[PDB]
């Protein structure tokens, strides 16, 4: 929420992220963050 | 009283009990991992 802070985190849903991630990757039952 | 069946058994491997593991394999259901019922 923009009344703290202006920085933000990505996620994407379905993928195996290691290989088609398109720093500071992590792997999720959930997807990548 | 004798609660063992219902009570989680330790040793087995998911937390769930007897009775809690039998009625998950019952249901033909179990969607392991979701990186994508067809
Ligand atoms: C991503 O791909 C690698 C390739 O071998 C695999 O080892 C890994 O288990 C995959 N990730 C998931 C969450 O399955």
Request: net charge negative.
């Given at each position: 929420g923009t009344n703290?802070?202006?920085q933000?985190?990505?996620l994407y849903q379905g993928v195996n992220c290691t290989?088609?991630?398109?720093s500071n990757v992590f792997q999720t039952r959930a997807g990548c963050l | 009283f004798?609660?063992?069946q219902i009570?989680?058994?330790?040793?087995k491997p998911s937390k769930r009990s007897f009775?809690?593991?039998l009625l998950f394999?019952?249901?033909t259901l179990a969607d392991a991992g979701?990186?994508?019922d067809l």
């Open positions: 703290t802070s202006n933000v985190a990505v290989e088609v991630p398109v | 004798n609660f063992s009570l989680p058994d330790p040793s009775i809690e593991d394999n019952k249901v979701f990186i994508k």
